[PDB]
Amino acid sequence: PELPEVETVRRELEKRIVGQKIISIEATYPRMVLTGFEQLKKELTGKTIQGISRRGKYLIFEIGDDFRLISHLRMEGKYRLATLDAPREKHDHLTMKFADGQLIYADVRKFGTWELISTDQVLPYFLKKKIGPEPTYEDFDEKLFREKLRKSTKKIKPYLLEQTLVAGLGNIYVDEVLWLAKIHPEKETNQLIESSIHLLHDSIIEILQKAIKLGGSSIRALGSTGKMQNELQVYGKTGEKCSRCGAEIQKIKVAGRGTHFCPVCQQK
DNA sequence: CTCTTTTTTCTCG
DNA sequence: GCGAGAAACAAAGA
Ligand SMILES: O=c1[nH]c(S)nc2[nH]cnc12
Numbered sequence: 001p002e003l004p005e006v007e008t009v010r011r012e013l014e015k016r017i018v019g020q021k022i023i024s025i026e027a028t029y030p031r032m033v034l035t036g037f038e039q040l041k042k043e044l045t046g047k048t049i050q051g052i053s054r055r056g057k058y059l060i061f062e063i064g065d066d067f068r069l070i071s072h073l074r075m076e077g078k079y080r081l082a083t084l085d086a087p088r089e090k091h092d093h094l095t096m097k098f099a100d101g102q103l104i105y106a107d108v109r110k111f112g113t114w115e116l117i118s119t120d121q122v123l124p125y126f127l128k129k130k131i132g133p134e135p136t137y138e139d140f141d142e143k144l145f146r147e148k149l150r151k152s153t154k155k156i157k158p159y160l161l162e163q164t165l166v167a168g169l170g171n172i173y174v175d176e177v178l179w180l181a182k183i184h185p186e187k188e189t190n191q192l193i194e195s196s197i198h199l200l201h202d203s204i205i206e207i208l209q210k211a212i213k214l215g216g217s218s219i220r221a222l223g224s225t226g227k228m229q230n231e232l233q234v235y236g237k238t239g240e241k242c243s244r245c246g247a248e249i250q251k252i253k254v255a256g257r258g259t260h261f262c263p264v265c266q267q268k
Numbered sequence: 269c270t271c272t273t274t275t276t277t278c279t280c281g
Numbered sequence: 282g283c284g285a286g287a288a289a290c291a292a293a294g295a
Pocket residue numbers: 179180181182242244262264265266
């Protein structure tokens with residue numbers, strides 16, 4: 001998932017598991033609990049979920065006053081709420097059992113992670129990761145954005161993907177953002193002019209906020225009812241029309257990543 | 269059969 | 282510092 005999908009999951013969970021006491025925690029893949037599964041099980045068992053937050057693509061379970069469970073779903077981690085008698089599925093790895101149901105984490109590629117962090121260590125956790133601002137008008141300052149772009153010779157798509165200029169873009173929304181902003185994904189950021197940086201800034205916020213409103217893009221669990229996939233202009237649409245007078249979407253490889261763009265729209 | 273393709277972090281030169 | 286490439290892993294497609 002990317003930020004909009006994680007936010008969609010956050011909202012669904014907030015409605016349903018806040019107030020729930022954790023009765024037990026079980027793992028078939030304890031290795032994805034980076035801070036130690038036995039430690040996590042000992043600390044959280046019997047605690048009540050106070051809330052669910054998000055920072056960039058990270059889910060943050062607030063559990064008791066003094067602990068946070070920081071979860072990253074990476075490529076295709078999925079949460080679902082199931083009855084206590086639900087059968088195990090092949091790629092289920094963890095479950096929190098409540099009195100009237102359970103929260104199960106599944107992840108085909110086993111990339112997703114769990115980390116138990118004390119409450120006063122959450123802000124330092126994200127500072128250490130150098131996560132950039134949330135993609136909102138209030139948090140995403142264009143002035144600082146502009147300065148960082150000026151000082152770098154990185155290509156704009158990989159730099160955006162680093163999460164340091166702004167949080168939340170993955171491969172899908174970065175291709176969508178760059179099409180909307182009419183910027184080439186290999187454009188060197190110090191070549192971007194002010195007006196272009198302004199459109200990029202606004203487009204990032206606009207695309208991500210639109211995606212959130214539409215419940216995320218559901219491609220191929222919680223977060224499965226999204227509609228943003230119907231609004232994608234370029235991602236995964238190789239050879240199809242940009243509706244720009246016959247122009248077709250091209251796919252290239254940029255810093256190891258599949259990259260969908262419309263050449264005529266996105267010249268350097 | 270092989271090869272490529274689909275978030276973050278790590279190694280190498 | 283940088284970029285390139287690969288690793289973690291599983292499954293699907295050419
Ligand atoms: O009108 C447009 N034409 C082209 S080619 N690319 C775009 N990106 C956002 N709007 C446009």
